[PDB]
Amino acid sequence: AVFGDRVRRFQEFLDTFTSYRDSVRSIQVYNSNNNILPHRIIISLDDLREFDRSFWSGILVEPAYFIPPAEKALTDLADSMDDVPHPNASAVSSRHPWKLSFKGSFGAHALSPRTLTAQHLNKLVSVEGIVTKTSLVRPKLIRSVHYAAKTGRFHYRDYTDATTTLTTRIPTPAIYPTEDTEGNKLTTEYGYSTFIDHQRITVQEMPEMAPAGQLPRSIDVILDDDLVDKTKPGDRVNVVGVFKSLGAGGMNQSNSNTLIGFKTLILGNTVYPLARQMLTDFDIRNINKLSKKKDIFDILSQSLAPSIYGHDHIKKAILLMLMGGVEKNLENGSHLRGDINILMVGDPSTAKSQLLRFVLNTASLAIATTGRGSSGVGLTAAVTTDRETGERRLEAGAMVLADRGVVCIDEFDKMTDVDRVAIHEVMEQQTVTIAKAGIHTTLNARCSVIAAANPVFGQYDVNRDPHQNIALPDSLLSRFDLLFVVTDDINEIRDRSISEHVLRTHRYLPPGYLEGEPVRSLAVGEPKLVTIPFLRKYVQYAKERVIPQLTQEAINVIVKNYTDLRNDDNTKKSPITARTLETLIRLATAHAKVRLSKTVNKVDAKVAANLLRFALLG
Amino acid sequence: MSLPAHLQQTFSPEEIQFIVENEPIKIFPRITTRQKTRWQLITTDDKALNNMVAMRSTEVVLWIALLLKQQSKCSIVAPQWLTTKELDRKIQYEKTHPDRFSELPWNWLVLARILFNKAKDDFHDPIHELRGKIQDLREIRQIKVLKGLKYLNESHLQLDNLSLLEINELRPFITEIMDKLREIHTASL
Amino acid sequence: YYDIDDVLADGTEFPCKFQYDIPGLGYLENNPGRPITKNTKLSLPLWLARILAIVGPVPFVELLPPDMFSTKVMNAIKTDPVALDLHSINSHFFSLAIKWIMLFSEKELANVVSELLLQRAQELNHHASSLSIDLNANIATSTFLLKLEEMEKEIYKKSHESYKDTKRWMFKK
Amino acid sequence: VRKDPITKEWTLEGGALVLADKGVCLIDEFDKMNDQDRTSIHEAMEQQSISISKAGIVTTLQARCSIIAAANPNGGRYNSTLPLAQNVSLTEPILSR
Amino acid sequence: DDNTEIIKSFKNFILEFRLDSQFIYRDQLRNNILVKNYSLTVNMEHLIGYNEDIYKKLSDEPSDIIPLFETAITQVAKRISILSLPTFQLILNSNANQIPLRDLDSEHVSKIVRLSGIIISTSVLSSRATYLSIMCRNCRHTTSITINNFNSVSLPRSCLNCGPDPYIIIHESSKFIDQQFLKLQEIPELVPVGEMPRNLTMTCDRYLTNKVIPGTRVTIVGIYSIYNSVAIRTPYIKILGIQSDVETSSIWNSVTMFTEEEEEEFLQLSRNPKLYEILTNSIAPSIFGNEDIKKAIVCLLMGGSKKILPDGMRLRGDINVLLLGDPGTAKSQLLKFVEKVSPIAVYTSGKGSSAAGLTASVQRDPMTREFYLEGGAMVLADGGVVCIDEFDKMRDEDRVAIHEAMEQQTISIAKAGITTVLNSRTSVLAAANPIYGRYDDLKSPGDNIDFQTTILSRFDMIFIVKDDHNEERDISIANHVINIHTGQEENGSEISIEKMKRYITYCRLKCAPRLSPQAAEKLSSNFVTIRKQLLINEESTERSSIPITIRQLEAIIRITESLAKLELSPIAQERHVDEAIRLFQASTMDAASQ
Amino acid sequence: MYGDLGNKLVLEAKRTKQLYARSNQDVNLPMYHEDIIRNILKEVSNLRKNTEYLKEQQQLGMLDDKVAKCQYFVTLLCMERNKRCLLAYQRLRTDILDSMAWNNNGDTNNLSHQEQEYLKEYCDLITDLKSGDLVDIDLSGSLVPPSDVFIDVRVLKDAGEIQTEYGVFNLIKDSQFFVRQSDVERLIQQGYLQKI
Ligand SMILES: Nc1ncnc2c1ncn2[C@@H]1O[C@H](COP(=O)(O)OP(=O)(O)OP(=O)(O)O)[C@@H](O)[C@H]1O
Ligand SMILES: Nc1ncnc2c1ncn2[C@@H]1O[C@H](COP(=O)(O)OP(=O)(O)OP(=O)(O)O)[C@@H](O)[C@H]1O
Ligand SMILES: [Mg+2]
Ligand SMILES: [Mg+2]
Ligand SMILES: [Zn+2]
């Protein structure tokens, strides 16, 4: 009775707003023309609230009774809209109803894994956090279709589960019917049965937002059908779903615990990424106009870490690393990486850690690790078991997680050789090889490595040769494209400048804050320095839509520079090698990418040579 | 300036008490002033005090009555409405009509407090029962006030039979909220 | 005119867009002593912005829609007035909203703000009425207090003091 | 610190000092002790407490035990001519305790 | 029958109690209902005074009587709030003698007991059942169950033919509450002779959850009950009230809890013209001299201000202090006092510490076979002070794990498939001895310090304390110690530990001063002068072991900001800059010059 | 820009107002912010110089009408803002001083010379007002309605045999009087006695 009234009311709501009808028509037209779009519609809670307050409130506080009616109304509207002449047997037998999706503003239901409490059960909530785990995808049985040869008719059965439907129903064992009502033998029609994908993920509270002295908490989320593979570990997501409770929770006499609560999880409706900034026509035009400037490189380099005084060359190297070179794989099998690795060895208090933090924040994908805080296994991959399935699998490590990204390693010299070996393999081959518990696989690890280290004595000594100063293996050192040695030199002018800069920085106050006040979302769906968001947009554009190709003049410059540097009496902080030629080519390609140029020109070669010369001979 | 900030636009509880003590009250004189010195007052009437006989009902001002009571020279006759039966009837009236307020005297709370503190032996009924009845009436009226506070608007507002102390308590919040609503509406035009 | 909170409210920066070419007005811009071209976008204090907008045919400046009166903020206000944290949006939200409404003769914002104020004042009065008691001789209260605007803070202080004084007089020994 | 066989969880065990609470701990051949070993008792001998921060176990114990130790001077025989410091290899803190 | 009479008696107690002219519990219930706080705190002395029979009934069978009291409270609340609301919670307060945690035995089964301990672990909130909606599989019969959380309940065994256990819970129509598990250890001073501290399992419900953090002493009132996990029962405590000396709510929230009478006591104290002297004298009153170290400890406790730049760069706001000195300097006693006075503090020994002890440890759950992260002294002491005694004894490996914690105030873990960045915003107060046990002036400073410059640069102030044999000072110290052994100003020259802790919390949560331009100019001039002097002081033989880098400028800025915060001053002037410069010269430049 | 100094001064005025509100009994005005007001006045002088230069340029120059109008309006508005900030700060301080003057029957280093002269003249005016037809009343009296004719008081600070108009009260410290509230109201006001 009430169910039909709610269905009719949601039908009226959908009729009033023609945008959803147009979206459904477009999806159906695209599917008919042809890879396929899932039967899902995103509706705005604000429009529903403006239309009917009662329905919006019910959906927010009592989704179990108000969502299925809306889904049925949407399915009926789509079916009435459908005009397919011949429905395929699988289509007729398919159980594919339209699923509703929500956006807008969740006033008090916008929470985090820490703030989810028993008072929010059976309510629509929005959870924001970081994905830490991801179960394997497996199909789930909802409908079974059978055939009786003698009768010549198809019989079907429908299955339900605690997680498949919002409303509780009698449990249904997965035992396939074998016999008809009259005793007729039945044959299972797998091709006509309906299965849907199922996956379980764990969303973790963001560590920065956790209380003082308390470890982050996490909540389990269930994804079905088209939301199965929308996330990977390490992603920041905004999940919308219905907080639910499952099981007896010790109520049953079989559990003697009498002190154990119920199980709880979320049945996800949406997954909203929190990584790629959409580029507008105005943004693209601004990027092009800024790139056309002759000194674009200087401005972009200066815009990185405005609070760090000096270190211009290190900033240029970081920018080139962010832009990255062009990766070429030859037919014979040789693989040439386009990533640029950077190492900084210097005296204490030289802004190495701050630079690492800044590159961690700015880079689209970045993972931070420490020397003493990491392990070989924690870097590569760990063997573990899947709760959902109970299947032996692999868990991505630091290196793996940062594929096509950047990994920042702090205190690089405070590590162990055991741990070092993993890294050595990673940088050398850009792949991870695992041989454990009957697992034989190769993991792609294509990440740029930026690390900071200290001398063995804790202070760089000019008298002693570079080999004695740094204890890291020579083989590991050779993989780094650029090595920067930074020392703290006492000079009156530089000391005064640095002190004034630090004092000016320490006097900053945030907007909307009174003096002496200590430093403490609305919607879900939603020579001048360059602002950081614009820098991110520029980096994304350049790294996505530019692949510079080499030219003859750049080659002449590169070979001239290599010949001059390798056979020169002047000593170098790092030995010259054929890898230096590849480093020069990579830096030239990165500089070409900076200017949004399809070809590498003499300017790029000159800039790369200057940077390499500064890094080598200071 | 001349007037503190907390005394601006409102009365302090002491001022409300001072206003209340100007009202008349019935007493039983324990002395015979009438003849068969003389009070000469300029704010109230002095005829009643001069023509006062022992154990004979007479009407005087509340503060004069309290001054006499301090000397044990007069027994204060409690108001008729301050009986257990009348308070019970008022509670029943409040319960039966969730939309209106009972027709209690405008000074019931202040007078009740004053009489409980100053005249404890004058009451015919036990003091604790009266305190409980007054507390229950106060909570019911508070519920009604909270329910009625939801209708604040830029236009007028009616609160009938509400006592003086409750109005004094609510004056700041009600006045400021209605003033801001009126300001917003005026700006809208 | 001499009320401190009104002076502070008029100092907030609002988006603006010049419509004329006025040399020598760079001091408003970040750089001093340079001409300011038309259509330039910058933020000016309310006292300068309002007068420049009204005075100046084509006026000197056009007042662009602020971020405090955006669709997102309006939707949040409609969804949950009590849970909405107005202090982070602005510390003089009601004063600036009244000024904007007076400037632009609009009624939708007036209705929204009136509803928000009423629904917030309900909880404000609840909290003000709530008083502590010493049995031997909080969290929600402070959580809501952190979300209040300046005018709401003043009203809360006045009402709380009135309630405390009445209770003290009633229960004085 | 050990892992409990039954509960498979890190746990705390007592030592010589613990066992000697409100008692005496006797350390024969004090001078033949390892440096590391020797250094252990520094906190116990004055603060009368043991602090442990291992495997997520953050706790402070009570060690109210007196220590009587026997040692041999450097070289196997005391040289009465030299100062006391040169006759033994112990450092200032341990000697002061 | 009897339950109705008990409920009526409790209702009468609630509606009739009064000590002068205020109905304490009636008004308290109304006020609690106003702010959506469905509970009621009852003082047991008042219950005893009103009627001893009610107290006797409550004490005899708490698990059966308390639910009736909750029902009575709910009925009274409905009467007082609604003009014709889940079940209310009862929180108890008592002054009965505290039973030692180890003295809890069979004799105290199913009784209300009061005890104090240290919380060492807290669990994640679970969900309990209060109102259950059930349906029968066969005949589909709708039924409901009301459950109280006090254990001496299950789904019916027989339907109302249907098989055993025929009812299935309908979840969307049920109501749940919050539950939490706590581990309570016994106070170190109360442990018996030669015994390991004992742990006790405890549970809290609804409004008693999220009230305590690990490592904080608390006092607990609850029921000593037992649950069957065959001839034995696992003991546990059902919490009825939590009383702690640390405002945990104001620590983990930007919200601050302080009564109006408190706020105005801390303002009057701040208005004192010489609060600095009072606080300096209030630290380690039993230790003679060491005034500069006491001032440094005051600065460390107050801490500086932390700034987050628009670009994302974050600046540290915690002050670290190192004490390198000879034996008998009373460094360990100062560390113990700092651990006692600070709102949050952990006292650890370098010797008895590890890399995994002091940061975080990957631990595998025995049952789930899943790896989790436990926390160490620098996670347990987040927002406080870590006293690392015997700093010199610490192994290199262990030591090296502290750098990021001290400087970046974060913990990076990449182990067993766990990739996370924890938060550790702590101040480190360390004590150590030179290489040879004394600072031998004959040898160079480099030979007297085995610490690498990298670790030393992180310490804002380094104190090289040398014991000088002066007859006058020796006599003064002997007299002071003798008076201590053989033997309360509280006249404005010193404040007790509790008041100092509360003031520290208030100042930290209230003020975050800023430097004025004159302060910045003076500080830049002093930094240039100090660096020039260090450059001049260098000798060809060796380079300065004590470093002077930008970190020292940041440390001086932090000291100035802490001095300004001491007086609740929104701005730091040259007056505080002078004191900060004097402290730096007295400690770090004093160590470096030698 | 231009009004930042005035905004800071108004922020300090708000801080002073909050301090006044929070304070229970004793209030001491902060030090007159001479430096900020000096900077504001210097800025006003610079704006006046700008206006004079603009007028001279218009008299002999290539400046056109629109530019001159806009610059003049901006300068005038900036001057108005600075004047408003200064006047608001001064008015708040004067109001607090007025309350202090009324609190007494009719240190100073924080006040400026103008404020000290203003306070002296206001006290003289209050005394002159008290000297008029309202002599029977004591305008600078208690604003709490009289409640009890006779009260118990206790001496808080030792003093000699002070001879009041109503009588002679030998104020020995730690000695109680049972007297009329009217007679000893002034002594309570000055803090010599206490109602308890
Ligand atoms: N060039 C600089 N400009 C501004 N601040 C600086 C600069 N160099 C260092 N600092 C300050 O140094 C403080 C701490 O130094 P930082 O952690 O960056 O050192 P680091 O290079 O990681 O050295 P190490 O790890 O060897 O101690 C930072 O807060 C930053 O303010
Ligand atoms: N100035 C002082 N006033 C009072 N007691 C003192 C003073 N100096 C030392 N003592 C006492 O001397 C003893 C020294 O022990 P303590 O553990 O405090 O030393 P320490 O400085 O940490 O030295 P160590 O490096 O040997 O551990 C303690 O009992 C302390 O009370
Ligand atoms: Mg570092
Ligand atoms: Mg010690
Ligand atoms: Zn049945």
PDB file of C-alpha atoms in Angstrom, chain C residues 11 45 47, chain F residues 1-10 40 43 47 78 81-82 85:
ATOM      1  CA  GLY C  11      36.041  45.764   6.437  1.00  0.00           C
ATOM      2  CA  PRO C  45      36.716  46.230   1.318  1.00  0.00           C
ATOM      3  CA  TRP C  47      33.211  50.399   2.498  1.00  0.00           C
TER       4      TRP C  47
ATOM      5  CA  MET F   1      45.936  48.858   1.373  1.00  0.00           C
ATOM      6  CA  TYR F   2      44.939  51.906   3.476  1.00  0.00           C
ATOM      7  CA  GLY F   3      42.463  50.889   6.183  1.00  0.00           C
ATOM      8  CA  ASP F   4      44.510  48.017   7.617  1.00  0.00           C
ATOM      9  CA  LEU F   5      45.856  50.126  10.488  1.00  0.00           C
ATOM     10  CA  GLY F   6      42.351  51.319  11.325  1.00  0.00           C
ATOM     11  CA  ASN F   7      41.077  47.745  11.212  1.00  0.00           C
ATOM     12  CA  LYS F   8      43.813  46.684  13.636  1.00  0.00           C
ATOM     13  CA  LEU F   9      42.910  49.576  15.941  1.00  0.00           C
ATOM     14  CA  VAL F  10      39.243  48.549  15.871  1.00  0.00           C
ATOM     15  CA  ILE F  40      46.916  56.518  11.069  1.00  0.00           C
ATOM     16  CA  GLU F  43      48.523  58.080   6.550  1.00  0.00           C
ATOM     17  CA  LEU F  47      46.195  61.084   1.617  1.00  0.00           C
ATOM     18  CA  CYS F  78      39.806  56.140   2.652  1.00  0.00           C
ATOM     19  CA  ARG F  81      37.203  55.023   6.911  1.00  0.00           C
ATOM     20  CA  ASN F  82      40.236  56.123   8.923  1.00  0.00           C
ATOM     21  CA  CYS F  85      37.959  53.849  13.011  1.00  0.00           C
TER      22      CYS F  85
END
